[PDB]
Design a protein around this ligand. Structure first.
Ligand SMILES: *[C@@H]1O[C@H](CO)[C@@H](O[C@@H]2O[C@H](CO)[C@@H](O[C@@H]3O[C@H](CO)[C@@H](O)[C@H](O)[C@@H]3O)[C@H](O)[C@H]2NC(C)=O)[C@H](O)[C@H]1NC(C)=O
Ligand SMILES: *[C@@H]1O[C@H](CO)[C@@H](O[C@@H]2O[C@H](CO)[C@@H](O[C@@H]3O[C@H](CO)[C@@H](O)[C@H](O)[C@@H]3O)[C@H](O)[C@H]2NC(C)=O)[C@H](O)[C@H]1NC(C)=O
Ligand SMILES: *[C@@H]1O[C@H](CO)[C@@H](O[C@@H]2O[C@H](CO)[C@@H](O)[C@H](O)[C@H]2NC(C)=O)[C@H](O)[C@H]1NC(C)=O
Ligand SMILES: *[C@@H]1O[C@H](CO)[C@@H](O[C@@H]2O[C@H](CO)[C@@H](O)[C@H](O)[C@H]2NC(C)=O)[C@H](O)[C@H]1NC(C)=O
Ligand code: NAG
Ligand code: NAG
Ligand code: NAG
Ligand code: NAG
Ligand code: CL
Ligand code: CL
Lengths: 654, 657
């Protein structure tokens, strides 16, 4: 190995232990705020919601980055927090922390402990209701809160939880929208479970003063990107159709999929540009089809066939690689019924098989050596996968994830794989399942073994996952409970907590400041360009029509980086090629193919769909520009959506 | 105190048999096969999705000397692996049938089973013409008759113990054996099963697939229990789901009759035997509690049995527990008016419920709602409480119940203790601190418990006097992370197997412990005492009366260390008891208030004619408020009367064809 390195001493005097005596129930630990030194340790209990129990949560606060903790349990005197609730941390730079508790003796309402200075000072407030779910911060204003009571009342606070007001009494689900909009479902005469498919979707812009009914016959609803979704039960055949709105519910249009029937729909992801939709195959055989939308979220086309989903739950391995724009990974079922990982580098326009890792000299079956990246489908299938793939936008290109080969042994015990180029290439870095975390904007990666035995080893990397070192952080191994990174782009502190076994809790805070004492210089970085699936240099590094140069620490780097891995210079526009286009409505890409062909059952038939009550006729060469793609020049295939005379029904709510 | 320091380590050290298994992946299952056969199977399984083809090798070990030695017989299942969901398909007791359902390591057109009819001493290999979606199910009437559902929703049946398979219907959602080799199954034509919920058809076959009969349409779900066939039917218009009951294998049906206004509520069958049905009905609003109703012996007419019965909102689990070691006894959990949890127990099959009594040596004395004992079952499980096992009892170990229990402290809820009852749950005593796995064997002559925690364990906690006395035995010097505890089958069994692993690459090991030398002395008359079951009505004249029958039970004296070879039931023929209030359910429209022995009419029904629909006929009920408990054999004494008078008016009690 050429990783090289002495580092023990730099960590030994930077490892801070705190023993928490006489703790029952689960222990939560959280850093509060960037560069505040604040850590909260909170004990919670698993108690049913309808049950009044006598208990006392313990609460500890550190203000020196985990070196010392003060018992501040007297603040939450005669209350306890439920494990499901935990803490209600606000936005990153908000300073808001709410501890939602219940009174030990029982009370008519819950009790919240509110802080607006990164948990340095709390005030107590009694609720006029029992919260059914944790309070929700409004993304636009952290002073606006909503909560659902145990009597299904929708409560709203304007002044950060001090004063609460009930605005509707029969609410099933409520979600914040943009600009402090509240969307919620309601019903009459019965329960929410009984009135499924007959709920009403309401909207509020006044924090509860006036309402608008934006949908009826509602089965469920959700938000994603700039899109509002609603599953509507039109016919009494229990058939459900997804309706999409981009104007906060004022106008709706049913999702238009090619070759429609009696299928189950699911939104995998959605941003400001497009919608990923999953549609189960008729028969509930465990695989479906991914469709991508246009920029209105209405017109869909085939993106990926045989997409695996869990029958009970609907989970898929669909993974947004947030560290590289336009990159998504998921799992499909081959014709040989072997699991495959597929990756797209163009937001679902084209998918390719995940490349085998280098140096894995396995060579028995062609479907062996295949790297399956584990996510929510693996989780749902009860595979030993403690974490989904992890990535951060500021840590450009880094993905850490559990993976397995085609062997049953590998599926029982997955390994930890690293990619530095957004998932184009992978390498096995750690044996066995681990919990992991990225911090210092990718400058530090930490992993901790997941097993039944107590652990005392931190595995860390400072060169974005290319070299790993083990640090024994204690001589009394602990049963692992949690791993938490200090927030912040240049954060260098991690917190491990766990127990020995009555049990004794302990937290270890490790500071990588002395490990990274040397600031990186020019030689410590290497440049790289993102992978593009079309051949040639001319589009090397192009993502959705944009070319940017990326930075990466050289292998064996041990130095603190202070710059962005995405160079803050002029991005160049790339020429359009096939990778910049989705297949059009009614077209698809066969496996390994770059060109779209028409779906066989649609050949000889006119391509038509309904766009807000109007019949539209589609003439196309088979391609349409990916939403958000900024390419100019080169490929420019034509398409035309001409308005017809006929009017159809694209909206089954009102 | 409990005993006087008896010497046991030497008697257990030479009877503890370790076997170290080398190179084991996946989950490790261990099962004794048969009574007094000496056969134990250890099987390696993998968590692999059904639709996925994988390369793997399950490992298979067989003991034939009661766990002292294990032979690697993996070559028998060479080039196959078994999914953890499937495990083994052990046949009925004393049948000798064992099926191992596996998939081929390279993939195949169908699954591969390994069939044994001599208690896993010899297996024959058989390839299936289909991929099984679920484990094959044995017919209760004939263990040679198997059925299974394929991955393509085809219903396959075998007449010769899995040797030859025949597909008898191709669009099946769920299939279940009835009596006399009857097959009930749901089917559809409009796409998938998930899409046709509420539009399925319920079919029946008595000919293993030759002739069929459609016994129901608009079916949402169906199930079997006791002599009762249940079907959930989605009536037209408003989506209102109603339970229909049939006692003639589906030839005729009648909708369940409950004394309440149609509130569009969710129904649930808690339990059912040859005599009656326990039904749980959620309160309108999905508020976490509901009401238990009991039926008559036809399963049609229900009455309130227990209010505020807690259920988990997602999944519908409850703490409803059948105390199988004492006839007529059931335990569950309710929500008090103070919104605190309570354990309620009935000794008369749901006629009357009482608060579980606090343990005598209580850990104490809204503040009074502490020290109340909550016995943990599936409600506690589904609420994610630290409860590794539900209450355990065996019919042969009369009166013995072992269960996890918590007091009203959030601390006690987080770390439940282990409680023992020797009288079917009337009285309880805390015996072990912290959650444990436990097993009963030797018809209650040996109770074994093992700590449940994150640390490796090496201690057996055992009792030879029905849980009154407990000793700790270190069975290994290398502690193991606990995986399984399995008793040898049999009324006089004395062998347990513990298996687990060290240092999570895991190294697996089994320990088989033989209590034979501990129980070398046979019990005699001096070691037993007699006891009578508890009855809620006062006076000796009904002491020990269970549902009309008075029986005397035996019980090993505290500190007993001897082998019992007789039944814990004394009286050859039970005497018939006089009827009293405990022998009567409340009638339709009546209920028992808390602590009350007498039934009173529900308030909303006073001033109205008690009427229900009985197989298309509108009936009128006049009653004193009581009806004999189905299965109760009491004679004489209290005789509250009732009349069901035909009103000669047609009603609809059957929303299926
Ligand atoms: C990771 O945790 C360590 C603690 O182990 C943090 O070190 C601490 O950083 C703070 C802020 O830079 C230092 O602030 C002090 O402020 C007072 C008041 O202005 C001043 O009088 C002191 O001279 C000092 O500047 C604090 O001393 C320092 N403690 C130690 C032990 O070095 C570190 O900031 C955390 N890392 C990151 C990136 O947040
Ligand atoms: C618990 O397990 C032990 C083994 O550790 C069992 O002891 C064994 O019992 C069997 C059957 O009673 C004995 O089998 C022998 O079979 C031959 C051939 O038929 C026969 O000639 C012998 O007379 C005897 O029956 C076996 O020798 C014996 N082994 C030991 C070590 O004691 C014990 O039966 C099990 N306990 C229970 C209650 O099942
Ligand atoms: C995948 O994740 C990335 C990063 O989290 C998302 O990109 C961000 O999208 C939001 C709007 O939804 C923008 O405000 C950010 O500026 C974007 N960041 C980057 C780095 O692109 C992306 O939208 C996600 N994809 C989907 C389908 O949700
Ligand atoms: C509760 O469990 C007991 C079993 O211990 C069931 O009672 C037995 O029922 C079977 C047939 O249903 C009879 O053959 C036994 O004779 C019964 N009792 C015993 C052990 O002698 C009882 O039916 C169960 N209750 C319910 C509602 O299922
Ligand atoms: C609150 O704390 C005080 C002492 O600080 C204690 O006496 C009191 O019992 C606590 N609250 C209750 C009612 O438990
Ligand atoms: C697609 O390419 C992969 C290799 O990346 C190959 O294994 C597979 O067979 C190809 N499929 C087709 C239809 O060409
Ligand atoms: C197991 O089967 C494989 C072929 O699948 C064969 O190569 C191997 O020799 C077999 N082993 C034994 C011991 O039968
Ligand atoms: C019934 O008795 C219990 C104690 O055994 C008591 O707690 C309860 O309050 C009594 N019922 C009523 C209605 O008061
Ligand atoms: Cl929106
Ligand atoms: Cl370790």
């Amino acid at each position: 190995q050429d990783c090289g390195r002495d580092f023990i001493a730099k960590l030994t005097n930077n490892t801070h232990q705190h023993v928490f005596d006489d703790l029952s129930g689960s222990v939560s630990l959280s850093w509060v705020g960037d560069s505040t030194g604040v850590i909260l340790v909170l004990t919670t209990f698993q108690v049913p919601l309808v049950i009044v129990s006598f208990g006392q949560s313990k609460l500890y606060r550190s203000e020196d980055y985990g070196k010392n903790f003060k018992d501040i349990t007297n603040l939450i005197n005669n209350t306890f927090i439920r494990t499901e609730f935990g803490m209600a941390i606000g936005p990153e730079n908000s300073g808001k922390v709410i501890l939602t508790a219940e009174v030990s003796g029982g009370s008519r309402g819950g009790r919240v402990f509110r802080s607006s200075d990164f948990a340095k000072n709390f005030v107590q407030t009694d609720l006029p209701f029992h919260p059914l779910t944790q309070m929700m911060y409004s993304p636009q204003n952290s002073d606006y809160l909503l909560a659902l009571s145990t009597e299904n009342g929708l409560w709203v606070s304007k002044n950060f939880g001090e004063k609460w007001e009930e605005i509707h009494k029969a609410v099933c689900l409520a979600k914040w929208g943009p600009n402090n909009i509240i969307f919620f479902t309601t019903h009459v005469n019965g329960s929410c479970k009984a009135d499924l498919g007959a709920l009403e979707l309401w909207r509020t812009s006044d924090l509860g003063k006036t309402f608008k009914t934006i949908g009826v016959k509602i089965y469920s609803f959700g938000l994603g990107g700039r899109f509002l979704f609603a599953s509507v039960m039109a016919d009494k055949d229990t058939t459900r159709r997804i309706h999409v709105s981009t104007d906060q519910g004022d106008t709706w249009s049913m999702a238009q999929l090619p070759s429609v029937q009696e299928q189950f729909y699911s939104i995998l992801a959605a941003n400001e540009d497009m919608v990923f939709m999953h549609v189960d195959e008729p028969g509930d055989t465990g695989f479906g089809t991914i469709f991508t939308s246009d920029d209105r979220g209405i017109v869909y086309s085939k993106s990926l066939d045989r997409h695996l989903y869990t029958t009970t739950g609907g989970e898929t391995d669909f993974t947004n690689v947030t560290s590289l724009r336009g990159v998504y990974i998921t799992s499909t079922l081959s014709e040989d019924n072997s699991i495959q990982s597929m990756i797209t580098f163009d937001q679902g326009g084209r998918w390719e098989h995940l490349r085998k890792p280098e140096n894995s000299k396995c060579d028995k079956n062609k479907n062996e050596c295949s790297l399956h990246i584990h996510a929510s489908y693996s989780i749902s299938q009860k595979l030993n996968v403690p974490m989904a793939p992890l990535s951060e936008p500021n840590a450009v290109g880094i993905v850490i994830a559990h993976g397995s080969v085609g062997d049953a042994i590998s599926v029982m015990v997955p390994d930890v794989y690293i990619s530095d180029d957004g998932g184009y290439s992978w390498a096995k870095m750690l044996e066995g399942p681990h919990y992991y975390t990225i911090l210092d904007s990718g400058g530090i990666i930490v992993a901790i073994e997941h097993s039944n035995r107590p652990i005392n080893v931190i595995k860390f990397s400072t060169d974005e996952g290319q070299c790993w070192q083990s640090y024994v952080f204690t001589q009394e191994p602990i049963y692992f409970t949690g791993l938490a990174s200090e927030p912040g782009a240049r954060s260098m502190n991690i917190s491990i907590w766990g127990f020995t076994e009555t049990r004794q809790w302990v937290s270890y805070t490790v500071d990588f400041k002395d490990i990274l004492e040397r600031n990186c210089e020019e030689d410590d970085y290497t440049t790289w360009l993102a992978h593009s699936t079309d051949p040639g240099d001319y589009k090397d590094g192009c993502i959705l029509g944009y070319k940017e140069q990326f930075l990466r620490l050289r292998k064996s780097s041990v130095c603190q980086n202070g710059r962005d891995y995405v160079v803050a210079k002029q991005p160049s526009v790339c020429p359009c090629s096939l990778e910049d286009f989705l297949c059009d409505f009614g077209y698809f890409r066969p496996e390994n193919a770059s060109e779209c062909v028409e779906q066989p059952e649609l050949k000889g038939h006119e391509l038509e769909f309904c766009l807000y009550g109007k019949e539209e006729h589609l003439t196309t060469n088979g391609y349409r520009k990916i939403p958000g793609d900024k390419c100019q020049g080169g490929m420019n295939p034509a398409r035309e959506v001409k308005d017809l005379k006929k009017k159809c029904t694209s909206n089954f709510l009102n």
